[PDB]
Amino acid sequence: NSYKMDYPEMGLCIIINNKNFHKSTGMTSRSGTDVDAANLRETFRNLKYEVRNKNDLTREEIVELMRDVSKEDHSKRSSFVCVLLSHGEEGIIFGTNGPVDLKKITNFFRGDRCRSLTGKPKLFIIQACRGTELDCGIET
Amino acid sequence: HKIPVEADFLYAYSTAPGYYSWRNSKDGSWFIQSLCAMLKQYADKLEFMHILTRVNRKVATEFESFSFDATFHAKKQIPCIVSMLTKELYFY
């Protein structure tokens, strides 16, 4: 019923905190995201997760980073967590220099490409826009 | 004995498909800020899907955008939990 959570380690928590975007992207600076990144670092350290904070990576560094973490040996760890903080669109997260498909990042951890993470929960926490629609709300 | 390669992933999205996501420039985004607040209160008490449900409630009820531009004023947000998990997840 419950995942095995009592491996020697809880696992990595990679936070990718993208705040400042190249002019070519037309994206504005993400004021406040440093508070999110500090908050998540303390929250997940407190869940006994091993936190790597990474700031202002390009789309290429992102996928290089994710490829590398997927090639690590996670046998002694219970789960895996990735937090993306950036601009985005439906299925797309923004590196500092442009867009990259979410599938590109998550395919690295698929059950057959990261065999040390097979049968273990893969957490992806995405703070990013998914389009340009506005929820007007309904009053209670 | 095979499992799907897409099994055991979980996607915690700040907002619903097709929608903006709102951020406060001093205290952080509504989602991360609600998610840390719920994870600090309930990680030793509730299964992760129920912590995420409380994050949905908090973001949906406690947050509303402010804009001088009326097109972007008084707007709301609901996060979106996307679960391919095959089991329950507890942090204790």
Partner: peptide
Amino acid sequence: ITAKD
């Protein structure tokens, strides 16, 4: 003043 991602 709220900002969009």
